Every structure is written in structure tokens, then in C-alpha cells.
Amino acid sequence: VLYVGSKTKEGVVHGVATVAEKTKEQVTNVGGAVVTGVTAVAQKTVEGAGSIAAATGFVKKD
Amino acid sequence: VLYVGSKTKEGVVHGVATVAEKTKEQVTNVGGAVVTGVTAVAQKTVEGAGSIAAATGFVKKD
Amino acid sequence: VLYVGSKTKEGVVHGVATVAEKTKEQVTNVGGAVVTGVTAVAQKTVEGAGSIAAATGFVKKD
């Protein structure tokens, strides 16, 4: 009863990736990263949020 | 009963990627990133939100 | 009853990766990173949040 968010399989396969084959250079710059798997919460009398996930950041070339 | 968000399979396969074959350079810049799998919440008396997911950021070249 | 966020399998397979085959250079720069598996919380009288996950950061090339 109430299988909320359950019985998953491969929730995410690559996220932030640089997949390739037969290359010669594979830089990968991610700055600040938070990678998690399952994030289950269970509340009863909330007055804020249940789960927040913010991501702020920029990229300058020159 | 109430299989909300359950029995998934490959929720997301690439997210933010740079897939290729037979290249010679594969930079990947992501700034600040939050990659998660399952995000299940279960509340009873909410007064805010259930799950927030903000993403702010820019990209300057020169 | 209430299988919230349970019975998962491979919550995330690569997160932040640089997968490849037959390359010659595989730099990977991640700055500051927080990698976790299961993040289960269970509250009763919340007045803030249930689980926060912020990620801030940038990438400068030159």
C-alpha cells in the first residue's frame, strides 16, 4: 500500500557524463556537485518544504 | 494500491551529456550540479511545498 | 505499508563520470563534491525542511 517512489531500477544512468568512444581528450569540469541515490523523507506536520534541491553556478570561457 | 511514482526503469539515461563517437576533444563544463535518483516524499499536513528543484546559472563566452 | 523510497536498485549508476573507451587522456575535475547513497529522514513536527541539497560553484577556463 502506497508504494510512493519505490521499486525503482536505474534511477539515473549518467547524470553528468562525457561518454565517448575512440577519442583523444576527455576533460570534465563540474565545479561543485552533489550526487545522491535515494532521498526519501516522511513528514507529518510540515510547514516548510519536503525536499529542496538547489543548484547555482556559472561558466566563463575567457 | 496507489503505485505513485513506482516501478520505474531507467528514469533518465543521460541527463547532461556529451555523447559522441570518433571525436578528438570532449570538454564538459557544468558549473554547479545536483544529480539524484529517486526523490520520494510523503507528507500529511503540508503548508509549503512537497519537493522543490531550482536551478539558476548562466554562461558567458567572452 | 508506506514503502516510501524503498526497494530501490541502482539509484544512480554514474553521477559525474567521464566514461570512454580507447582514449589517451581522461582528466576529471570536480571541485567540491558530496556523494551519498541513501538519505532517509523521518520527522513529525517539522518547521524547516526535510532534506536540503545545495550545490554552488563555477568553472573558469582562462
UniProtKB/Swiss-Prot annotation, chains A, B, C:
Cu cation binds at residue 14. The modification Phosphoserine is found at residue 51. Its main location: cytoplasm. Phosphorylated, predominantly on serine residues. Phosphorylation by CK1 appears to occur on residues distinct from the residue phosphorylated by other kinases. One of its GO terms (biological process) is long-term synaptic potentiation. Residues 1-31 are annotated as: 4 X 11 AA tandem repeats of [EGS]-K-T-K-[EQ]-[GQ]-V-X(4). GO terms for molecular function: actin binding; alpha-tubulin binding; beta-tubulin binding; calcium ion binding; copper ion binding; cuprous ion binding; cysteine-type endopeptidase inhibitor activity; dynein complex binding. Keywords: Acetylation, Alzheimer disease, Amyloid, Cell projection, Copper, Cytoplasm, Disease variant, Membrane, Metal-binding, Neurodegeneration, Nucleus, Parkinson disease, Parkinsonism, Phosphoprotein, Repeat, Secreted, Synapse, Ubl conjugation. It is found in: Cytoplasm; Membrane; Nucleus; Synapse. Sequence repeats lie at residues 6-20, 21-31. The 'non A-beta component of Alzheimer disease amyloid plaque' domain (NAC domain) is involved in fibrils formation. The middle hydrophobic region forms the core of the filaments. The C-terminus may regulate aggregation and determine the diameter of the filaments. Neuronal protein that plays several roles in synaptic activity such as regulation of synaptic vesicle trafficking and subsequent neurotransmitter release. Participates as a monomer in synaptic vesicle exocytosis by enhancing vesicle priming, fusion and dilation of exocytotic fusion pores. Mechanistically, acts by increasing local Ca(2+) release from microdomains which is essential for the enhancement of ATP-induced exocytosis. Belongs to the synuclein family. Soluble monomer. Homotetramer. A dynamic intracellular population of tetramers and monomers coexists normally and the tetramer plays an essential role in maintaining homeostasis. Interacts with UCHL1. Interacts with phospholipase D and histones. Interacts (via N-terminus) with synphilin-1/SNCAIP; this interaction promotes formation of SNCA inclusions in the cytoplasm. Interacts with CALM1. Interacts with STXBP1; this interaction controls SNCA self-replicating aggregation. Interacts with SNARE components VAMP2 and SNAP25; these interactions allows SNARE complex assembly and integrity. This is Alpha-synuclein. It comes from Homo sapiens (Human). The gene is SNCA. The chain holds residues 37 to 98 of 140 of the full protein.
